[PDB]
PDB file of C-alpha atoms and ligand atoms in Angstrom:
ATOM      1  CA  UNK O  28      42.644  22.888  71.569  1.00 21.88           C
ATOM      2  CA  UNK O  29      43.289  26.540  72.325  1.00 22.46           C
ATOM      3  CA  UNK O  30      40.948  28.883  70.393  1.00 23.12           C
ATOM      4  CA  UNK O  31      43.421  31.650  69.549  1.00 25.09           C
ATOM      5  CA  UNK O  32      42.547  35.105  68.282  1.00 22.14           C
ATOM      6  CA  UNK O  33      43.006  35.791  64.537  1.00 28.90           C
ATOM      7  CA  UNK O  34      45.109  38.778  65.887  1.00 28.17           C
ATOM      8  CA  UNK O  35      47.315  37.396  68.715  1.00 27.75           C
ATOM      9  CA  UNK O  36      49.022  35.249  66.030  1.00 27.37           C
ATOM     10  CA  UNK O  37      49.985  38.412  64.053  1.00 28.76           C
ATOM     11  CA  UNK O  38      52.299  40.008  66.663  1.00 27.91           C
ATOM     12  CA  UNK O  39      53.846  36.573  67.581  1.00 25.53           C
ATOM     13  CA  UNK O  40      54.929  36.054  63.908  1.00 27.99           C
ATOM     14  CA  UNK O  41      55.959  39.786  63.563  1.00 28.33           C
ATOM     15  CA  UNK O  42      52.853  40.893  61.540  1.00 27.44           C
ATOM     16  CA  UNK O  43      53.013  37.692  59.367  1.00 25.53           C
ATOM     17  CA  UNK O  44      56.385  38.582  57.774  1.00 24.75           C
ATOM     18  CA  UNK O  45      57.081  36.001  54.970  1.00 25.57           C
ATOM     19  CA  UNK O  46      60.967  36.245  54.951  1.00 28.03           C
ATOM     20  CA  UNK O  47      63.716  33.769  56.215  1.00 30.52           C
ATOM     21  CA  UNK O  52      62.246  37.078  58.767  1.00 33.64           C
ATOM     22  CA  UNK O  53      59.415  34.771  59.997  1.00 35.80           C
ATOM     23  CA  UNK O  54      58.655  32.100  57.291  1.00 33.44           C
ATOM     24  CA  UNK O  55      59.925  28.537  57.745  1.00 33.13           C
ATOM     25  CA  UNK O  56      58.021  27.216  54.739  1.00 33.78           C
ATOM     26  CA  UNK O  57      55.156  27.237  52.227  1.00 31.91           C
ATOM     27  CA  UNK O  58      52.827  24.769  50.535  1.00 31.58           C
ATOM     28  CA  UNK O  59      49.520  24.761  48.656  1.00 36.42           C
ATOM     29  CA  UNK O  60      46.490  25.899  50.743  1.00 36.39           C
ATOM     30  CA  UNK O  61      48.841  28.079  52.981  1.00 37.85           C
ATOM     31  CA  UNK O  62      52.121  29.541  54.508  1.00 38.21           C
ATOM     32  CA  UNK O  63      54.116  28.322  57.673  1.00 35.05           C
ATOM     33  CA  UNK O  64      55.322  31.072  60.074  1.00 34.98           C
ATOM     34  CA  UNK O  65      57.480  30.774  63.271  1.00 34.51           C
ATOM     35  CA  UNK O  66      55.650  32.346  66.229  1.00 40.32           C
ATOM     36  CA  UNK O  67      56.469  32.688  69.893  1.00 38.02           C
ATOM     37  CA  UNK O  68      53.445  32.201  72.227  1.00 35.27           C
ATOM     38  CA  UNK O  69      54.201  32.451  75.996  1.00 36.21           C
ATOM     39  CA  UNK O  70      57.580  30.599  76.160  1.00 35.12           C
ATOM     40  CA  UNK O  71      56.623  28.102  73.490  1.00 32.99           C
ATOM     41  CA  UNK O  72      57.885  28.315  69.884  1.00 36.12           C
ATOM     42  CA  UNK O  73      55.028  27.360  67.511  1.00 35.73           C
ATOM     43  CA  UNK O  74      54.307  26.856  63.792  1.00 39.77           C
ATOM     44  CA  UNK O  75      51.341  28.926  62.684  1.00 38.73           C
ATOM     45  CA  UNK O  76      49.976  27.758  59.296  1.00 40.52           C
ATOM     46  CA  UNK O  77      47.845  30.615  57.938  1.00 43.35           C
ATOM     47  CA  UNK O  78      45.541  29.183  55.241  1.00 44.22           C
ATOM     48  CA  UNK O  79      45.756  30.694  51.694  1.00 43.44           C
ATOM     49  CA  UNK O  83      43.247  26.575  42.511  1.00 44.43           C
ATOM     50  CA  UNK O  84      41.137  25.750  45.650  1.00 41.53           C
ATOM     51  CA  UNK O  85      38.006  27.821  46.623  1.00 40.69           C
ATOM     52  CA  UNK O  86      37.302  29.762  49.893  1.00 39.09           C
ATOM     53  CA  UNK O  87      34.792  27.125  51.226  1.00 37.05           C
ATOM     54  CA  UNK O  88      37.269  24.325  50.366  1.00 39.11           C
ATOM     55  CA  UNK O  89      39.922  25.832  52.701  1.00 43.14           C
ATOM     56  CA  UNK O  90      37.284  25.774  55.513  1.00 43.08           C
ATOM     57  CA  UNK O  91      36.527  22.061  54.789  1.00 46.68           C
ATOM     58  CA  UNK O  92      40.309  21.300  55.022  1.00 48.48           C
ATOM     59  CA  UNK O  93      40.520  23.472  58.217  1.00 48.11           C
ATOM     60  CA  UNK O  94      37.657  21.527  59.923  1.00 52.00           C
ATOM     61  CA  UNK O  95      39.059  18.155  58.746  1.00 48.50           C
ATOM     62  CA  UNK O  96      42.480  19.007  60.232  1.00 49.39           C
ATOM     63  CA  UNK O  97      40.751  19.861  63.584  1.00 47.77           C
ATOM     64  CA  UNK O  98      38.451  16.752  63.518  1.00 47.84           C
ATOM     65  CA  UNK O  99      41.366  14.348  62.753  1.00 43.98           C
ATOM     66  CA  UNK O 100      43.757  15.935  65.317  1.00 43.86           C
ATOM     67  CA  UNK O 101      41.083  15.783  68.022  1.00 41.45           C
ATOM     68  CA  UNK O 102      41.033  11.931  67.942  1.00 39.21           C
ATOM     69  CA  UNK O 103      44.524  11.327  66.540  1.00 40.92           C
ATOM     70  CA  UNK O 104      47.326  11.653  69.104  1.00 40.39           C
ATOM     71  CA  UNK O 105      50.534   9.680  68.459  1.00 41.88           C
ATOM     72  CA  UNK O 106      54.263  10.575  68.964  1.00 42.17           C
ATOM     73  CA  UNK O 107      54.672  10.081  65.197  1.00 38.45           C
ATOM     74  CA  UNK O 108      51.973  12.666  64.299  1.00 35.17           C
ATOM     75  CA  UNK O 109      52.492  16.400  64.789  1.00 33.36           C
ATOM     76  CA  UNK O 110      50.286  17.903  67.474  1.00 34.00           C
ATOM     77  CA  UNK O 111      47.780  20.736  66.931  1.00 31.82           C
ATOM     78  CA  UNK O 112      47.693  23.156  69.843  1.00 28.57           C
ATOM     79  CA  UNK O 113      44.910  25.245  68.431  1.00 28.42           C
ATOM     80  CA  UNK O 114      43.593  27.510  65.663  1.00 27.02           C
ATOM     81  CA  UNK O 115      41.870  30.921  65.170  1.00 27.26           C
ATOM     82  CA  UNK O 120      40.800  34.067  57.561  1.00 26.83           C
ATOM     83  CA  UNK O 121      41.908  30.676  59.101  1.00 26.53           C
ATOM     84  CA  UNK O 122      45.053  29.773  61.208  1.00 27.10           C
ATOM     85  CA  UNK O 123      46.332  26.416  62.589  1.00 26.89           C
ATOM     86  CA  UNK O 124      48.918  26.416  65.428  1.00 27.66           C
ATOM     87  CA  UNK O 125      51.207  23.335  65.796  1.00 25.54           C
ATOM     88  CA  UNK O 126      54.087  22.214  67.992  1.00 23.53           C
ATOM     89  CA  UNK O 127      57.282  23.671  66.430  1.00 22.20           C
ATOM     90  CA  UNK O 128      59.511  21.049  64.730  1.00 24.77           C
ATOM     91  CA  UNK O 129      63.104  22.372  65.200  1.00 26.11           C
ATOM     92  CA  UNK O 130      64.395  20.240  62.290  1.00 26.20           C
ATOM     93  CA  UNK O 131      61.641  21.047  59.745  1.00 24.88           C
ATOM     94  CA  UNK O 132      60.586  18.605  57.043  1.00 22.79           C
ATOM     95  CA  UNK O 133      62.405  15.420  55.859  1.00 25.89           C
ATOM     96  CA  UNK O 134      62.476  16.992  52.353  1.00 26.33           C
ATOM     97  CA  UNK O 135      64.520  19.963  53.597  1.00 26.81           C
ATOM     98  CA  UNK O 136      66.912  17.697  55.540  1.00 26.28           C
ATOM     99  CA  UNK O 137      67.414  15.344  52.619  1.00 25.35           C
ATOM    100  CA  UNK O 138      68.263  18.421  50.496  1.00 24.64           C
ATOM    101  CA  UNK O 139      70.358  19.921  53.402  1.00 24.77           C
ATOM    102  CA  UNK O 140      68.428  23.188  53.101  1.00 27.37           C
ATOM    103  CA  UNK O 141      70.106  26.159  54.909  1.00 27.56           C
ATOM    104  CA  UNK O 142      73.289  24.067  55.370  1.00 25.52           C
ATOM    105  CA  UNK O 143      72.108  21.468  57.894  1.00 24.23           C
ATOM    106  CA  UNK O 144      74.299  18.276  57.920  1.00 23.62           C
ATOM    107  CA  UNK O 145      73.172  15.333  55.751  1.00 24.29           C
ATOM    108  CA  UNK O 146      71.201  12.789  57.839  1.00 21.78           C
ATOM    109  CA  UNK O 147      73.132   9.598  58.373  1.00 23.93           C
ATOM    110  CA  UNK O 148      71.704   6.248  57.293  1.00 22.67           C
ATOM    111  CA  UNK O 149      71.183   5.403  60.991  1.00 21.72           C
ATOM    112  CA  UNK O 150      68.891   8.457  61.509  1.00 25.40           C
ATOM    113  CA  UNK O 151      67.338   7.740  58.054  1.00 27.42           C
ATOM    114  CA  UNK O 152      66.335   4.200  59.241  1.00 27.35           C
ATOM    115  CA  UNK O 153      64.874   5.599  62.506  1.00 28.35           C
ATOM    116  CA  UNK O 154      62.774   8.220  60.509  1.00 28.85           C
ATOM    117  CA  UNK O 155      61.467   5.532  58.097  1.00 26.22           C
ATOM    118  CA  UNK O 156      60.332   3.469  61.173  1.00 25.59           C
ATOM    119  CA  UNK O 157      58.864   6.598  62.830  1.00 21.56           C
ATOM    120  CA  UNK O 158      56.908   7.631  59.687  1.00 22.67           C
ATOM    121  CA  UNK O 159      55.590   4.023  59.204  1.00 24.03           C
ATOM    122  CA  UNK O 160      54.437   3.983  62.909  1.00 25.62           C
ATOM    123  CA  UNK O 161      52.646   7.321  62.288  1.00 23.72           C
ATOM    124  CA  UNK O 162      50.920   5.928  59.157  1.00 24.50           C
ATOM    125  CA  UNK O 163      50.092   2.699  61.084  1.00 23.05           C
ATOM    126  CA  UNK O 164      48.263   4.678  63.808  1.00 17.34           C
ATOM    127  CA  UNK O 165      46.323   6.547  61.045  1.00 17.02           C
ATOM    128  CA  UNK O 166      45.260   3.294  59.233  1.00 14.55           C
ATOM    129  CA  UNK O 167      44.588   1.484  62.590  1.00 15.06           C
ATOM    130  CA  UNK O 168      42.194   4.381  63.318  1.00 10.85           C
ATOM    131  CA  UNK O 169      40.649   4.107  59.775  1.00 11.08           C
ATOM    132  CA  UNK O 170      42.136   7.316  58.339  1.00 10.90           C
ATOM    133  CA  UNK O 171      43.596   7.757  54.841  1.00 12.73           C
ATOM    134  CA  UNK O 172      46.171  10.624  54.918  1.00 12.85           C
ATOM    135  CA  UNK O 173      45.888  11.224  51.125  1.00 11.00           C
ATOM    136  CA  UNK O 174      49.143  13.351  50.830  1.00  8.31           C
ATOM    137  CA  UNK O 175      52.093  11.270  52.244  1.00  9.66           C
ATOM    138  CA  UNK O 176      55.343  12.975  51.130  1.00  8.21           C
ATOM    139  CA  UNK O 177      58.660  13.975  52.668  1.00  7.09           C
ATOM    140  CA  UNK O 178      57.548  17.690  52.967  1.00  8.21           C
ATOM    141  CA  UNK O 179      54.697  16.433  55.271  1.00  5.57           C
ATOM    142  CA  UNK O 180      57.050  14.231  57.409  1.00 10.42           C
ATOM    143  CA  UNK O 181      58.295  16.658  60.099  1.00 12.30           C
ATOM    144  CA  UNK O 182      61.262  16.266  62.479  1.00 10.98           C
ATOM    145  CA  UNK O 183      61.497  17.228  66.213  1.00  9.86           C
ATOM    146  CA  UNK O 184      64.705  18.144  68.109  1.00  8.13           C
ATOM    147  CA  UNK O 185      65.527  14.341  68.482  1.00 10.14           C
ATOM    148  CA  UNK O 186      64.755  13.788  64.720  1.00 10.03           C
ATOM    149  CA  UNK O 187      61.551  11.833  65.589  1.00 11.10           C
ATOM    150  CA  UNK O 188      59.398  11.604  62.446  1.00  9.25           C
ATOM    151  CA  UNK O 189      56.048  13.310  62.905  1.00  7.30           C
ATOM    152  CA  UNK O 190      53.504  12.985  60.006  1.00  8.01           C
ATOM    153  CA  UNK O 191      51.565  16.223  59.276  1.00  9.23           C
ATOM    154  CA  UNK O 192      48.720  17.762  57.118  1.00 11.62           C
ATOM    155  CA  UNK O 193      45.335  16.060  57.710  1.00  9.90           C
ATOM    156  CA  UNK O 194      43.323  18.622  55.653  1.00 10.74           C
ATOM    157  CA  UNK O 195      43.002  16.182  52.706  1.00 12.83           C
ATOM    158  CA  UNK O 196      42.554  13.164  55.063  1.00 14.39           C
ATOM    159  CA  UNK O 197      39.454  10.899  54.874  1.00 10.62           C
ATOM    160  CA  UNK O 198      37.843   8.607  57.489  1.00 11.93           C
ATOM    161  CA  UNK O 207      35.886   7.473  44.401  1.00 13.63           C
ATOM    162  CA  UNK O 208      36.109  11.349  44.340  1.00 14.97           C
ATOM    163  CA  UNK O 209      35.400  14.191  41.825  1.00 17.12           C
ATOM    164  CA  UNK O 210      38.123  16.494  43.307  1.00 19.99           C
ATOM    165  CA  UNK O 211      41.500  14.688  42.696  1.00 20.65           C
ATOM    166  CA  UNK O 212      43.971  16.164  45.206  1.00 21.77           C
ATOM    167  CA  UNK O 213      47.599  15.494  46.285  1.00 24.58           C
ATOM    168  CA  UNK O 214      51.238  15.687  45.060  1.00 20.33           C
ATOM    169  CA  UNK O 215      51.569  14.124  41.586  1.00 20.05           C
ATOM    170  CA  UNK O 216      55.187  12.884  41.945  1.00 20.93           C
ATOM    171  CA  UNK O 217      54.144  10.878  45.069  1.00 22.03           C
ATOM    172  CA  UNK O 218      50.662   9.742  43.945  1.00 22.58           C
ATOM    173  CA  UNK O 219      49.499   6.209  43.226  1.00 24.54           C
ATOM    174  CA  UNK O 220      47.854   5.432  39.827  1.00 25.05           C
ATOM    175  CA  UNK O 221      44.406   4.869  41.434  1.00 25.98           C
ATOM    176  CA  UNK O 222      44.795   8.100  43.512  1.00 24.88           C
ATOM    177  CA  UNK O 223      45.370  10.103  40.277  1.00 26.33           C
ATOM    178  CA  UNK O 224      42.182   8.499  38.970  1.00 23.57           C
ATOM    179  CA  UNK O 225      40.240   9.656  42.064  1.00 19.63           C
ATOM    180  CA  UNK O 226      40.216   6.444  44.144  1.00 17.96           C
ATOM    181  CA  UNK O 227      40.455   6.900  47.950  1.00 17.25           C
ATOM    182  CA  UNK O 228      42.055   3.842  49.618  1.00 16.46           C
ATOM    183  CA  UNK O 229      44.775   3.515  52.364  1.00 14.22           C
ATOM    184  CA  UNK O 230      46.692   1.421  49.727  1.00 15.37           C
ATOM    185  CA  UNK O 231      47.421   4.828  48.048  1.00 12.54           C
ATOM    186  CA  UNK O 232      49.262   5.914  51.255  1.00  7.84           C
ATOM    187  CA  UNK O 233      51.535   2.796  50.998  1.00  6.72           C
ATOM    188  CA  UNK O 234      52.512   3.778  47.393  1.00  7.59           C
ATOM    189  CA  UNK O 235      53.379   7.363  48.500  1.00  7.60           C
ATOM    190  CA  UNK O 236      55.405   6.034  51.462  1.00  5.67           C
ATOM    191  CA  UNK O 237      57.408   3.918  48.920  1.00  8.87           C
ATOM    192  CA  UNK O 238      58.290   7.219  47.111  1.00  8.99           C
ATOM    193  CA  UNK O 239      59.445   8.664  50.471  1.00  8.12           C
ATOM    194  CA  UNK O 240      61.526   5.477  51.029  1.00  7.83           C
ATOM    195  CA  UNK O 241      63.175   6.109  47.619  1.00  6.64           C
ATOM    196  CA  UNK O 242      63.868   9.802  48.586  1.00  9.22           C
ATOM    197  CA  UNK O 243      65.353   8.514  51.927  1.00  7.60           C
ATOM    198  CA  UNK O 244      67.708   6.092  50.079  1.00  6.60           C
ATOM    199  CA  UNK O 245      68.795   8.489  47.275  1.00  3.60           C
ATOM    200  CA  UNK O 246      68.507  11.968  48.843  1.00  9.14           C
ATOM    201  CA  UNK O 247      66.825  12.738  45.497  1.00  8.87           C
ATOM    202  CA  UNK O 248      63.557  14.722  45.466  1.00  6.40           C
ATOM    203  CA  UNK O 249      60.453  12.942  43.951  1.00  2.65           C
ATOM    204  CA  UNK O 250      60.400  15.609  41.191  1.00  6.03           C
ATOM    205  CA  UNK O 251      63.306  17.452  39.565  1.00  8.76           C
ATOM    206  CA  UNK O 252      62.662  19.733  36.545  1.00  7.80           C
ATOM    207  CA  UNK O 253      66.387  19.754  35.576  1.00  9.69           C
ATOM    208  CA  UNK O 254      66.934  15.927  35.774  1.00  9.34           C
ATOM    209  CA  UNK O 255      66.346  12.785  33.658  1.00  6.81           C
ATOM    210  CA  UNK O 256      64.251  10.934  34.913  1.00  8.87           C
ATOM    211  CA  UNK O 257      62.181  13.872  36.260  1.00  6.73           C
ATOM    212  CA  UNK O 258      60.228  11.335  38.422  1.00  2.85           C
ATOM    213  CA  UNK O 259      62.120   9.418  41.125  1.00  2.35           C
ATOM    214  CA  UNK O 260      59.710   6.418  41.021  1.00  2.10           C
ATOM    215  CA  UNK O 261      60.974   5.878  37.392  1.00  2.95           C
ATOM    216  CA  UNK O 262      64.232   4.531  38.983  1.00  4.65           C
ATOM    217  CA  UNK O 263      62.186   1.512  40.152  1.00  3.73           C
ATOM    218  CA  UNK O 264      62.008   0.718  36.423  1.00  5.08           C
ATOM    219  CA  UNK O 265      65.605   1.798  35.621  1.00  6.58           C
ATOM    220  CA  UNK O 266      67.025  -0.531  38.338  1.00  2.07           C
ATOM    221  CA  UNK O 267      64.403  -3.315  37.555  1.00  4.18           C
ATOM    222  CA  UNK O 268      65.717  -3.370  33.921  1.00  5.62           C
ATOM    223  CA  UNK O 269      69.529  -2.733  34.156  1.00  7.66           C
ATOM    224  CA  UNK O 273      70.331   0.658  43.260  1.00  5.76           C
ATOM    225  CA  UNK O 274      73.889   0.919  44.699  1.00 10.90           C
ATOM    226  CA  UNK O 275      74.301   3.531  41.860  1.00 11.81           C
ATOM    227  CA  UNK O 276      71.435   5.565  43.440  1.00 11.10           C
ATOM    228  CA  UNK O 277      72.368   5.392  47.217  1.00 11.28           C
ATOM    229  CA  UNK O 278      72.753   8.978  48.529  1.00 11.29           C
ATOM    230  CA  UNK O 279      76.534   9.685  48.474  1.00 10.90           C
ATOM    231  CA  UNK O 280      76.149  12.212  51.382  1.00 11.74           C
ATOM    232  CA  UNK O 281      76.259   9.133  53.717  1.00 16.24           C
ATOM    233  CA  UNK O 282      79.290   7.241  55.072  1.00 17.87           C
ATOM    234  CA  UNK O 283      77.377   4.774  57.397  1.00 19.30           C
ATOM    235  CA  UNK O 284      74.958   3.036  54.882  1.00 20.87           C
ATOM    236  CA  UNK O 285      75.324  -0.688  54.056  1.00 20.53           C
ATOM    237  CA  UNK O 286      74.370  -2.834  51.079  1.00 20.19           C
ATOM    238  CA  UNK O 287      72.110  -5.171  53.154  1.00 16.38           C
ATOM    239  CA  UNK O 288      70.094  -2.467  55.036  1.00 19.90           C
ATOM    240  CA  UNK O 289      69.894  -0.285  51.878  1.00 19.88           C
ATOM    241  CA  UNK O 290      68.735  -3.356  49.824  1.00 20.05           C
ATOM    242  CA  UNK O 291      66.258  -4.214  52.623  1.00 18.23           C
ATOM    243  CA  UNK O 292      64.759  -0.620  52.614  1.00 21.67           C
ATOM    244  CA  UNK O 293      64.620  -0.684  48.743  1.00 20.09           C
ATOM    245  CA  UNK O 294      62.801  -4.051  48.797  1.00 19.73           C
ATOM    246  CA  UNK O 295      60.105  -2.406  51.010  1.00 20.72           C
ATOM    247  CA  UNK O 296      59.892   0.672  48.634  1.00 25.20           C
ATOM    248  CA  UNK O 297      59.639  -1.704  45.613  1.00 24.93           C
ATOM    249  CA  UNK O 298      56.781  -3.633  47.334  1.00 27.94           C
ATOM    250  CA  UNK O 299      55.128  -0.308  48.257  1.00 30.16           C
ATOM    251  CA  UNK O 300      55.442   0.921  44.669  1.00 29.67           C
ATOM    252  CA  UNK O 301      53.513  -2.067  43.200  1.00 30.08           C
ATOM    253  CA  UNK O 302      51.355  -0.603  40.344  1.00 32.41           C
ATOM    254  CA  UNK O 303      48.374  -2.742  41.486  1.00 32.99           C
ATOM    255  CA  UNK O 304      47.106  -1.485  44.919  1.00 35.95           C
ATOM    256  CA  UNK O 305      45.983  -4.977  46.124  1.00 36.75           C
ATOM    257  CA  UNK O 306      49.486  -6.493  45.540  1.00 34.79           C
ATOM    258  CA  UNK O 307      51.067  -3.792  47.788  1.00 33.35           C
ATOM    259  CA  UNK O 308      51.673  -4.630  51.510  1.00 35.98           C
ATOM    260  CA  UNK O 309      49.559  -3.117  54.333  1.00 33.59           C
ATOM    261  CA  UNK O 310      51.208  -0.544  56.727  1.00 29.26           C
ATOM    262  CA  UNK O 311      51.530  -3.283  59.424  1.00 31.55           C
ATOM    263  CA  UNK O 312      53.703  -5.369  56.977  1.00 32.37           C
ATOM    264  CA  UNK O 313      55.739  -2.269  55.921  1.00 31.47           C
ATOM    265  CA  UNK O 314      56.250  -1.433  59.666  1.00 34.85           C
ATOM    266  CA  UNK O 315      57.307  -5.073  60.363  1.00 33.77           C
ATOM    267  CA  UNK O 316      59.684  -5.151  57.358  1.00 34.06           C
ATOM    268  CA  UNK O 317      61.341  -1.851  58.474  1.00 32.57           C
ATOM    269  CA  UNK O 318      61.777  -3.271  62.016  1.00 32.14           C
ATOM    270  CA  UNK O 319      63.354  -6.482  60.537  1.00 33.15           C
ATOM    271  CA  UNK O 320      65.961  -4.043  58.981  1.00 31.92           C
ATOM    272  CA  UNK O 321      67.510  -3.295  62.447  1.00 30.78           C
TER     273      UNK O 321
HETATM  274  C1  LIG X 401      52.249  21.212  60.679  1.00 27.79           C
HETATM  275  C2  LIG X 401      53.045  22.057  59.719  1.00 27.79           C
HETATM  276  C3  LIG X 401      52.366  23.341  59.382  1.00 27.79           C
HETATM  277  O1  LIG X 401      54.259  22.359  60.455  1.00 27.79           O
HETATM  278  C4  LIG X 401      55.458  22.664  59.855  1.00 27.79           C
HETATM  279  C5  LIG X 401      55.624  22.762  58.507  1.00 27.79           C
HETATM  280  C6  LIG X 401      56.912  23.007  57.942  1.00 27.79           C
HETATM  281  C7  LIG X 401      57.152  23.106  56.531  1.00 27.79           C
HETATM  282  C8  LIG X 401      56.164  22.651  55.514  1.00 27.79           C
HETATM  283  C9  LIG X 401      55.773  21.311  55.437  1.00 27.79           C
HETATM  284  C10 LIG X 401      55.039  20.837  54.366  1.00 27.79           C
HETATM  285  C11 LIG X 401      54.675  21.701  53.340  1.00 27.79           C
HETATM  286  C12 LIG X 401      53.936  21.218  52.200  1.00 27.79           C
HETATM  287  N1  LIG X 401      53.345  20.871  51.286  1.00 27.79           N
HETATM  288  C13 LIG X 401      55.013  23.045  53.429  1.00 27.79           C
HETATM  289  C14 LIG X 401      55.739  23.510  54.506  1.00 27.79           C
HETATM  290  C15 LIG X 401      58.409  23.448  56.086  1.00 27.79           C
HETATM  291  C16 LIG X 401      59.472  23.622  56.960  1.00 27.79           C
HETATM  292  C17 LIG X 401      59.294  23.480  58.302  1.00 27.79           C
HETATM  293  C18 LIG X 401      58.014  23.181  58.832  1.00 27.79           C
HETATM  294  C19 LIG X 401      57.793  23.076  60.219  1.00 27.79           C
HETATM  295  C20 LIG X 401      56.543  22.837  60.733  1.00 27.79           C
HETATM  296  C21 LIG X 401      56.475  22.799  62.235  1.00 27.79           C
HETATM  297  N2  LIG X 401      55.318  22.479  62.815  1.00 27.79           N
HETATM  298  O2  LIG X 401      57.470  23.137  62.901  1.00 27.79           O
END
């Protein structure tokens, strides 16, 4: 990785201007700026609830994981440098933004949506094959290149029972919320993503009943077609029902009843 200067990333991102303007996005633990190094467009994630030493631990984890983990379905770290992390620029941002059509981008078709699901699952498979638990699988963390290839991101929380429960609540597994660290938690979160992919509905909505997307698993299991994202003209009952079946299996309340990433991957390939 290239050891950048904590200064050469300032003038590439126009003195860290947080407008739509040099700011693509924002999350917890930091801000994502669009920089231009050499002839390469980059994503510089300046790190900013959590303590100062805890950002450093998440900075070093990110480096350590990215050093050994290289897959076309994982974003690539180019380097780092106050703490910065420079990544390959994803021209199509996050899956969350695309599902919401943020900044007027066209709605992803079901065809692309099936390819992204397979891409994301391959990315997770590499991580689990290499004995890594992501610990924060969510559509904001599934990035998209110019060809809409799904690239999983954010390995700061990743691990090769805990006191510091961390992650996104709307996506979290019951045992994860209780502080358990198992790759089975990642499966559960991927099932939430699968539900966002089918419905175009975000995992959490303040001004919506149910507020939590995963509560539709119950709504449909009691009373699915009614939830398919209407901003699609190319979806079909069989492939939609086949993706839902995977999400339903992923969303099993009991971690041990859930399928492993290899099975999920296989089931998503059986879709096409
Ligand atoms: C490796 C990361 C830093 O790269 C990107 C993060 C992006 C985000 C983002 C994603 C997740 C959260 C959360 N939680 C917050 C912001 C939004 C929009 C576009 C993005 C593009 C990139 C990129 N590399 O082009």
